[PDB]
């Protein structure tokens, strides 16, 4: 028998993933993403646009 780690079985599964299961999972992901979009949409220092600093060592202590 051919094992799970066999190269030919891997290539068979890759063709299956690319040609058969792929569009189905893509359409499902599109529908779920659209539903969750519906739910989701339903100075620099003083404004935070300039990312300033927040309010064991890699070196030797000096």
């Amino acid at each position: 028998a051919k094992s799970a780690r066999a190269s030919r079985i891997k290539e068979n599964h890759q063709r299956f993933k690319k040609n058969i299961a792929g569009p189905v999972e893509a359409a499902r992901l599109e529908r779920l993403s659209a539903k969750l979009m519906a739910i989701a949409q339903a100075s620099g220092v003083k404004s935070g646009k300039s990312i300033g600093r927040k309010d064991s060592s890699i070196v030797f202590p000096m």
Partner: peptide
């Protein structure tokens, strides 16, 4: 405080 400037800069830090 400051119209959420700290929240905004943390969001920008995650963004960039």
């Amino acid at each position: 405080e400051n119209n959420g400037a700290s929240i905004t800069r943390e969001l920008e830090r995650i963004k960039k």
